[PDB]
Amino acid sequence: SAVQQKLAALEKSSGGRLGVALIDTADNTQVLYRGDERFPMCSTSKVMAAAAVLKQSETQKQLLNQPVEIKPADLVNYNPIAEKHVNGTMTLAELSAAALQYSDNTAMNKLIAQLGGPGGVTAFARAIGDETFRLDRTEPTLNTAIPGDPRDTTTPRAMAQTLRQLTLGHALGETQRAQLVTWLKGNTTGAASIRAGLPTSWTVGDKTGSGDYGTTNDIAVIWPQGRAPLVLVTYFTQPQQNAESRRDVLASAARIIAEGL
Ligand SMILES: *C(=O)N1C[C@H](NOS(=O)(=O)O)CC[C@H]1C(N)=O
């Protein structure tokens, strides 16, 4: 009830710019707030990159087990998993899991490289019907989050539709969809974001993101108790380049959405 008033009031109180897109798969209804504005994706772009490698593995049948060299020069700003394997190798499956569940930025860059560069991630988006997503840069510069810059952005509406296709539809093969869902459900970084605004009995798979301009993001597939799943994108960015993160705003948006159902 009064969901637009509530989302607008949350945004005004926060001082920033909030983007929300919900898909309720029980009845195909949607809730949108700035659903067609571009937002910097930051680490949420890793879902597209992992899904694109999963799609490649549908025809390169051993691709996920292929070793990839991790060198000291490859390390960037946040490499919790890759730093354990420097001067050795990690498989593409291990890199996908590290990128999704620990938000390892070196693992992300290896996914991007496997795909031929950022354009290869965008090409996969286009191949599954997403005409809005764009990846332009590698880690860490994809997180600059400069206002008005279209690089490394998407809209909430597009990314909710794509996450639905990837996790509940048929953009990926059956086994690969299940693998993506398993990875998202095992995310380690999400308890303060969308999940925090939902009843604890519901099951969530998600991927968070953060960047400059206090950018605080989360994209999630949600299995409520006793009812069909939801897909929810909450993107948030702020006026000051050095702004603090606001995961509480994402949780509040999810809480508003959960009471309106
Ligand atoms: C992704 O947005 N990033 C990589 C890592 N993500 O952790 S988060 O998903 O918990 O925010 C650190 C922050 C961010 C980056 N590299 O700036």
Residue numbers in the entry: 27 to 57, 59 to 238, 240 to 252, 254 to 290
Show passages lifted from the paper.
By combining microcrystal electron diffraction with native mass spectrometry (ED-MS), we develop an approach to rapidly and accurately determine structures of biosynthetic or clinically relevant ligands bound to enzymes. We demonstrate this approach with the model protein lysozyme bound to its noncovalent ligand N,N′,N″-triacetylchitotriose (ACT), then use the cysteine protease papain as a scaffold on which to bind a panel of both known and potential inhibitors, including the epoxide-based covalent cysteine protease inhibitor E-64 (27), its commercially available chemical analogs, and analogs generated by biosynthetic reaction. Last, we extend the ED-MS workflow to interrogate crystals of the β-lactamase enzyme, CTX-M-14, which imparts resistance to β-lactam-containing antibiotics by hydrolyzing their four-membered ring structural motif. Overall, our results demonstrate that structures of protein–ligand complexes can be obtained directly from microcrystal slurries by ED-MS, with unambiguous confirmation of the identity of the bound ligands.
